[PDB]
Each structure stands twice: as structure tokens, then as C-alpha cells.
């Protein structure tokens, strides 16, 4: 009674490689596969499936590709290892300290010539050697430093991921899905929505919002070794700036080899900072607490404390805006105890140019100076929190892997392998 | 009516007796600027290999060119002791695939031999 | 010759189909282009074979189907089509209907297979 059928609607969980796609230079010229102007989404009637955002290989692929693309983007660029010399250094010109005015003897287009050049630097990229004082660039003892090409943008233009033939992606429509287990309402797509390849630490600056309620997801909650990812159901408006009209100059250091140096500052010298709506922020923390209590007790007191110590990438909120790297002191955002029964918060931010973009050793990128004045506007869509671990449950903001900023969009998607061949008994025989 | 087309996986949640009508929908979608593009070439090649393995088996079993083929191989019961009135009407293909997954290789081996015997007999007749 | 039948009328050309069919698939940097070309030739080949399979025309260069011609696609007499036109001209003549004809072929084959199963089950 055996009958063989082909085109059977079954699948198995499988790990495959997804490809990127784009809707009409980093990211910007990464045309990938052009997207479908009007993609089809197929609801699966009667179909449920289990998802697990903490074990999602799609997250691993975004990491793999994002990191690879940034390394590839520096391949043709001018190296700054020729700048690893001793610098003589003093203050800039200010009354009463982040900036330094340092000078050195640099190479020129000819091997027989040298030039005296100088530029402005941020303290965080410069270290004293002679414990004017003598300094070296802080990363020259351990890593290569490569200048990013000044013509290349890293704007996080959203890209889509798509399954290859033989594969399809299942997507959740469950507004309350907590990242794991059965997902009662699903559909199948070939491609995910576009996701901005944003890098951040403590705050999630430009993702999607929860449909109804703030969603709190964690691999465990109970286990304090795990992170808690909080997805807001409304954005928080944040305005950041580097309020200094800076100029830039190029230096010829070799045959077609140019270095971009900070020139001077027009006007006042001011600290970089971010403005977070105070009223909105207080409301969002209250919403977070109401939802956090579901795991801690209805009348359990929840406290928001500041970050733990360590490198700026884990103690501050960092981001890339205008090409500059900001390290914002978010302690001003986490100062509250929530007990059962217009204005703004200004966070100072530090600026760095030599960046270990993926927290790796040996590959440092130098961010060339950005001219003019920088203004950044973003939608905070979520937080990365950890438990500070008996009547009060304290949470602190903190950093984590870049993977955690991507699973935040990818938790709704799973990829499976289509297996169209199979058999069943019937009443027929040849 | 209801414009029922369902879609690529379509009614994956429907029972087998309803689902095996969209076999062609799936079949038609199985084949669908500088460097490092090897990732896509690898994906293309693997899709081809999967397609060919399925086609070869349909060939070996004598079911080539069909989405549905009857064979002359008996159901041996131990594989599934469910009634056809239960299998086709109250089960989906996904549930079914799991239900008999441990016999995949048994059925496939039996199918190959049956076809081997059938071709042998046809040649004896054509040689008559 | 592979395209020797290209200027022939349809009624003359559809005898050389094997001549064309049999020639369809036939250390460093750039080897990727060569590999890509081979892969793409395979994909093209497989799509055609899959459709012939789907329509019930597998293994044939010429197959009759049980689908009627619906006239609006072309109102030319068969004698005009086969004797006074080439395949290239014809391909242009009914270009826009490709998806209609194929949709009908696909539906028909499914109905035929369904009926075969009902008879084998009887």
C-alpha cells in the first residue's frame, strides 16, 4: 500500500547560511541581492512551532558578516603605524582637560625628508611614556592602527536576510512571545525585515518597538549570569552632540599616503553629551518595573543603579555617530528606587578615535576627524540590564556582546530546511 | 471558494488528505559583485545536490516524473498501525513524518528492490 | 549545426530538437567565474527539466498534452503557424501568454495524477 509523495510540506530545523539583501560605502554599496519591492508573507493556518532566540544561528551570522565587512572595509586604507613615534605634548588653549596638543617628526613623500607636524588628540588615545611631557599613541605597543578611509561611511543602513533555495524562514506574530518555546501564530517568509546593523552597549538605540507592552526577555532571569533584554513599547528620544566646530587637515606622509589630523577648534571647547527626555525616561523605567515584577514579586522593590567598573565599552554607553565614537555616562539615567504602593537628563560623553571595534586585540581602527558640529538623533528602543546578584531587586545597565543587539530583532525568526520527499500508505497499488 | 491557494508551504497544518494537493506548489519553488561570493556559490551547489538526490530516488523507485506514485510495496503495519481513516484525515504530513521517521530506510530499501524486480521482468518479456 | 534550424519554419525545425537539446548543458583568481558559469548552466538545465516533469512531458522532446488551445493567444491557422513561421517569430507571437499556458498545463497534470491514483486505488 506504499505511495510515494513529493512536495510534502515538512521541514526540519537546520543551520544554513543566509544571504543579505538590500532595498535600492559600508552597507551603502553592499547591494547584496536586491530585495522584493512587495514581499509575500504566508500565514500558516493551524501551525505552531518552537523558537529559541538564545540559540539562534542567525545572530551568529550577523556577527560573522558584520565583523567581516568592517575588516574588509579597511583593507585598502592607509596604515597609521608610521605615526608610532614619541610626541611632545602640552595643553591646547583653554582656561582652567580632555584634549591634548601634541607634536612629532613625521615622514613625507620622500624618505630623505621629515616634517614637523602636530595635531589635536583626545586623552583616551594618548599615553605618557616619560613617567612638555613625552607621549606615545596608546595602542602602538600592541596593535596595528589603520585609518578608516575618510570617504567611507558606516551608516547602519538596514539590510534584510534571506534564506537560500531549499530553506525558508518562519516568523512569529506573537506579540507576547518571550523568546523561547511554542509560538502559536507563525508565517513563512523568504526574507526578514530590514535590520539596521547598529552597534551599542548599554542602550539599544534604533530597533523595533514592542507592539503592546514592554517585553522583558532573558535566557534565564533566575540565573544572574544572564543578560536581560528589555524591549520598549515606545521610543525614548535621545539627542547627542559633539558641540565643537572642528576642522581637519590632511598630511602627506608618503606616496599617495594621507593622514587625517584634527586641525583646530573654532569657538568654545565643550563636552560631548546626550540629552534624554526626563519625563519619558521616568515613564519607561516605571513600565519596565511593572513588567520586571512579574519575575520578582508584585510588591518587590526594584532599584536602578549605575554600571560596574571596567573598560568604557562596558561602563558607558557607546555609539558611532558622524564617524565619532561616543562614550556616554549613563549613570545619570539609573538613579531610582521603585516601591510598590518638560525636562531632560544630560549625560557627558567622552570621545575616542582609536577603536577596537569588535573588542579584539591587534586590529585597531582610527576614526579620522570629522569636521563641523555633530548632532545625533535616535529612538531608544531598549536596554541591556543585569541583576545585581532580599526585598529589593537591584538592576544595573551594562554592556555585553554585540550579538545581544541583534537577537533583539532576530528573536522572531527561525530557519528550517524543507524536506519535500516522503511516503504514506494508501489503497492503491501499481 | 475562499480563493484557496494557501501558499508555498500552504496549509502545512492541514491533514495529509488535504495537504497533498499542493505538492506542485512546493516543487516549483525548490530550484528558485566582486569577491567572497563563494558563499553563494556554495549555497547554489548544495541546493542542486539536494534536488538531485531526491530526483535520483524517484528514478530508482520508478516514480520519476510524478508527484504521487503508487508502488507495489506492501505496508508492513509495524511501521504504523493507524487506520487510513486516521492517517489521512486526522494527521498532518509533519506529524506523519515524525510518526514513521524510523522506517524511512526500510521503506526506501524495499522500494529499490521492487523496482529492480520490475525492470528485470520487463526485460525478460521484451526478450520473449 | 546547433542553430542551423534557426531560420527554418516551425514545421521544419521541430525535427532537430535533439540537436539543440544535446548542446544545452555541454588554479587561481577568476576560477570562481568559471565555476559560477558551470553552476548557472546547471540551474538553467534543471528548471527546464523540472517543468517538463511537472507538466508530464518528462523524457520527451515533443509531448502532447490534454490542454486545448484557447484561440485568443493566437488566431492563426495551424498551417500558417507551422509552415510560414519560424520558432523565433512564434516565440515572440505568443510571448505574453507563457504564464497562462503553463498554469493550465500544471493544473491539468495534477488532475491527471489525481485520477490515476483514484483508479489504482480501485
Amino acid at each position, epitope marked *: 500500500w506504499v505511495t510515494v509523495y513529493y512536495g510534502v510540506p515538512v521541514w526540519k530545523d537546520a543551520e544554513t547560511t543566509l544571504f543579505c539583501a538590500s532595498d535600492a560605502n559600508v552597507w551603502a554599496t553592499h547591494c547584496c541581492v536586491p530585495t522584493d519591492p*512587495n514581499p*509575500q*508573507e*504566508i*500565514h500558516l*493556518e493551524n501551525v505552531t512551532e518552537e523558537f529559541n532566540m538564545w540559540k539562534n544561528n542567525m545572530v551568529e551570522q550577523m556577527h560573522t558578516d558584520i565583523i567581516s565587512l568592517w575588516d574588509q572595509s579597511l583593507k585598502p586604507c592607509v596604515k597609521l603605524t608610521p605615526l608610532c613615534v614619541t610626541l611632545q605634548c602640552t595643553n591646547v588653549t583653554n582656561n582652567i582637560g580632555e584634549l591634548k596638543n601634541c607634536s612629532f617628526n613625521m615622514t613625507t613623500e620622500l624618505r630623505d625628508k621629515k616634517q614637523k607636524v602636530y595635531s589635536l588628540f583626545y586623552r583616551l588615545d594618548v599615553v605618557q611614556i616619560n613617567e612638555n611631557k613625552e607621549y606615545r599613541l596608546i595602542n602602538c605597543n600592541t596593535s596595528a592602527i589603520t585609518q578608516a578611509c575618510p570617504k567611507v561611511s558606516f551608516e547602519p543602513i538596514p539590510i534584510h536576510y534571506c534564506a537560500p533555495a531549499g530553506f525558508a524562514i518562519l516568523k512569529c506574530k506573537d506579540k507576547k512571545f518571550n523568546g523561547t518555546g511554542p509560538c502559536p501564530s507563525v*508565517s513563512t517568509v523568504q526574507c526578514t525585515h530590514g535590520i539596521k546593523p547598529v552597534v551599542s552597549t548599554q542602550l539599544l538605540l534604533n530597533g523595533s518597538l514592542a507592539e503592546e507592552e514592554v517585553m522583558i526577555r532573558s535566557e534565564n532571569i533566575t540565573n544572574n549570569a544572564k543578560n536581560i533584554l528589555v524591549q520598549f513599547n515606545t521610543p525614548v528620544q535621545i539627542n547627542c552632540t559633539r558641540p565643537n566646530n572642528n576642522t581637519r587637515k590632511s598630511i602627506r606622509i608618503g606616496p599617495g599616503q594621507w593622514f587625517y589630523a584634527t586641525g583646530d577648534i573654532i569657538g568654545d571647547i565643550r563636552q560631548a553629551h546626550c540629552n534624554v527626555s526626563k519625563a519619558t525616561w521616568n515613564e519607561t523605567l516605571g513600565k519596565v518595573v511593572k513588567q520586571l515584577r512579574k519575575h520578582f514579586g508584585n510588591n518587590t522593590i526594584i532599584r536602578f543603579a549605575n554600571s560596574s567598573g571596567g573598560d568604557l565599552e562596558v561602563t558607558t554607553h557607546s555609539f558611532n555617530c558622524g564617524g565619532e565614537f561616543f562614550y556616554c555616562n549613563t549613570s545619570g539615567l539609573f538613579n531610582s528606587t521603585w516601591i510598590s504602593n518638560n525636562d531632560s537628563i544630560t549625560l557627558p560623553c567622552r570621545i575616542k578615535q582609536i577603536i577596537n571595534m569588535w573588542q579584539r586585540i591587534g586590529q585597531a581602527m582610527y576614526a579620522p576627524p570629522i569636521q563641523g558640529v555633530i548632532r545625533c538623533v535616535s529612538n531608544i528602543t531598549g536596554l541591556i540590564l543585569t541583576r545585581d546578584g532580599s526585598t529589593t531587586e537591584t538592576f544595573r545597565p551594562g554592556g555585553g556582546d554585540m550579538r545581544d543587539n541583534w537577537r533583539s530583532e532576530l528573536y522572531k525568526y527561525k530557519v528550517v530546511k524543507i524536506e519535500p520527499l516522503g511516503v504514506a500508505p494508501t489503497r492503491c497499488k501499481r | *471558494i*475562499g*480563493a*484557496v*491557494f*494557501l*501558499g508555498f508551504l*500552504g496549509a502545512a497544518g492541514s491533514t495529509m488528505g488535504a495537504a497533498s494537493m499542493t505538492l*506542485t*506548489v512546493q516543487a516549483r519553488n525548490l530550484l528558485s559583485l566582486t569577491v567572497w561570493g563563494i558563499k553563494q556559490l556554495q549555497a547554489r551547489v548544495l541546493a542542486v545536490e539536494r534536488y538531485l538526490r531526491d530526483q535520483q530516488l524517484l528514478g530508482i523507485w520508478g516514480c520519476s516524473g510524478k508527484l504521487i506514485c503508487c508502488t507495489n510495496v506492501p505496508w508492513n503495519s509495524s511501521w504504523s498501525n493507524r487506520n487510513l481513516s486516521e492517517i489521512w484525515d486526522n494527521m498532518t504530513w509533519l506529524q506523519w513524518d515524525k510518526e514513521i521517521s524510523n522506517y524511512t530506510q526500510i521503506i526506501y530499501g524495499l522500494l529499490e528492490e521492487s523496482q529492480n524486480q520490475q525492470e528485470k521482468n520487463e526485460q525478460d518479456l521484451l526478450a520473449l | 549545426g546547433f542553430l542551423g534550424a534557426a531560420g527554418s519554419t516551425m514545421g521544419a525545425a521541430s525535427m532537430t530538437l535533439t540537436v539543440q537539446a544535446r548542446n544545452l548543458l555541454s588554479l587561481t583568481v577568476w576560477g570562481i567565474k568559471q565555476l559560477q558559469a558551470r553552476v548557472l548552466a546547471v540551474e538553467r538545465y534543471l528548471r527546464d527539466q523540472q517543468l517538463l516533469g511537472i507538466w508530464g512531458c518528462s523524457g520527451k522532446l515533443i509531448c502532447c498534452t490534454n490542454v*486545448p488551445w*484557447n*484561440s*485568443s493567444w493566437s488566431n492563426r491557422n495551424l498551417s500558417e503557424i507551422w509552415d510560414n513561421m519560424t520558432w523565433l517569430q512564434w516565440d515572440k507571437e505568443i510571448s*505574453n501568454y507563457t504564464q*497562462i499556458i503553463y*498554469g*493550465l498545463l*500544471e*493544473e*491539468s497534470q*495534477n*488532475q491527471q495524477e489525481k485520477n490515476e491514483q483514484d483508479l489504482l486505488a480501485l
Partner: antibody, heavy 123, light 112 residues
Framework: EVQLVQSEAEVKRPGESLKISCQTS????????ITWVRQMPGKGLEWMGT????????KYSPSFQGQVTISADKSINTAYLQWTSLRASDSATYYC????????????????WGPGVLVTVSS | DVVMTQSPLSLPITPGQPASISCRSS???????????LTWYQQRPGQPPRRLIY???NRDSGVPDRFIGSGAGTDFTLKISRVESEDVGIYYC?????????FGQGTKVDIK
């Protein structure tokens, strides 16, 4: 090409029953759907209902759900709409619309309307 | 149910000039099979309606290039690149759903 042929216009007094019909011709297709619509003078269309003649399965519009019925008649390439009785409110132009559907596609390749047949109610 | 309105419902058009008609739904016209089903019809006085556009933007057979469809969700429209006297009549946005099937209000196009 595909055409629908409709029956003659007719006038009834209220309380009298009526059969109206359409015929299909000029093509040879497998699955197709038939639906009826009504056009009231000065108005757009009201959906009356639809049937798949292959299976003889009809959903109908909520309006007229219990007032008018339809037949099937695939075997003779026709379609029917039957009123149990007519009311003054039923004076309108009636249409058959045929939707040619491919079972493997999900698309309606042919959307053909007859010209419209009046059914009127008088005294 | 899909309740469909149109706007404007009265559209005199300077002859030879472009114009468009809005189509607005009570709910999404996206089907579970993933396709959006919405069609446009042209009913000239004295005629049955003709389908112009299939599945929101697919110009149908023999349909002038003058007719462009677009939209998504609940927001749809018909654009006419230039309006001819030949285009005078009532345009309808037809609704294909999970039943009941319905038609929108209808927009009259005239010349002025």
C-alpha cells in the same frame, strides 16, 4: 475569447418567483468560479454570492442569505439565480461574473462580466 | 468585513491631465496565502465594468498604460497618467477577502 451570455430581462409582480441565468462560452477552462452581483439604479454593486460549480459549494452574501438561492450546472456550462419571490426592492440590473482560477496559481486570470440583465418588479 | 470607501467620489478632470482615486479599507486586504487581493474596475455608462488592474498593481490584458495601480494594507490607489474622454465613467475598487466579498463606493470621473 471568454464571454458570458445572459438570459432575457423580465418583469414580475411582487410575490412572484423568478429564475435568471447565464451561460459561458468561447473558451475551454477547468476550474472557474461564478458569482452574482446586483447593481441598483444610481448605485455601485452589492455582492449577492458565489459558487464553485465543480463541487457545487456556495457561501452567499449575508444579504439575501435566506431570500435567493443559486444552482450549479457545471455540466451544461450555465449558472442560475432563483428568487423565492420578488419584492419591489429587487428591481435592479443583475450580473454574472466569472472568475477563471488556476488551482496551482492562486490567480484569477479571467474576470468577465455579462452586460447586465434587468429584473424589475411592477403591478 | 471589508468596508471600502473611495475618495473623491466625484472627480471632474481637466482633459488630458493626470488624476488619481483613493481606496480605503476597514481592514487589511492581505490574505493568509500572502498575496494582497484588490482590483480596479472601469464602468463606462451603458457598460459592465472591465477589470483594469489585478492584485493592486497588475495592469490587465489590453488595459491602457494610462492606468497605474499601487498600495498596501488598507491604503490603495488608482492613478491615471492622463485622462481621456474615453475614461469617463465610474471607477470601482473591488474587495477580495475572507468573505463577504464587497465593492467600494465608486468614483465618478468626468471632464472639466
Amino acid at each position: 475569447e471568454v464571454q458570458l451570455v445572459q438570459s432575457e430581462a423580465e418583469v414580475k409582480r411582487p410575490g412572484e418567483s423568478l429564475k435568471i441565468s447565464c451561460q459561458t462560452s468561447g473558451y475551454n477552462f477547468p476550474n472557474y468560479w461564478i458569482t452574482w452581483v446586483r447593481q441598483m439604479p444610481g448605485k455601485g454593486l452589492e455582492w449577492m454570492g458565489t459558487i464553485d460549480p465543480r463541487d457545487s459549494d456556495t457561501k452567499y452574501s449575508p444579504s439575501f442569505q435566506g431570500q435567493v438561492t443559486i444552482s450549479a450546472d457545471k455540466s451544461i456550462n450555465t449558472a442560475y439565480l432563483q428568487w423565492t419571490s420578488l419584492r419591489a426592492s429587487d428591481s435592479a440590473t443583475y450580473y454574472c461574473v466569472m472568475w477563471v482560477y488556476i488551482l496551482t496559481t492562486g490567480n484569477i486570470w479571467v474576470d468577465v462580466w455579462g452586460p447586465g440583465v434587468l429584473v424589475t418588479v411592477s403591478s | 468585513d471589508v468596508v471600502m470607501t473611495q475618495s473623491p467620489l466625484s472627480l471632474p478632470i481637466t482633459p488630458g491631465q493626470p488624476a488619481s482615486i483613493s481606496c480605503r479599507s476597514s481592514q487589511s486586504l492581505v490574505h493568509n496565502n500572502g498575496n494582497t487581493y484588490l482590483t480596479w474596475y472601469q464602468q463606462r455608462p451603458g457598460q459592465p465594468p472591465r477589470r483594469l488592474i489585478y492584485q493592486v498593481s497588475n495592469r490587465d490584458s489590453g488595459v491602457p498604460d494610462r492606468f497605474i495601480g499601487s498600495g498596501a494594507g488598507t491604503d490603495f490607489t488608482l492613478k491615471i497618467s492622463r485622462v481621456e474622454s474615453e475614461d469617463v465613467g465610474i471607477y470601482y475598487c473591488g474587495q477580495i477577502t475572507d468573505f463577504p466579498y464587497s465593492f467600494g463606493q465608486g468614483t465618478k470621473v468626468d471632464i472639466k
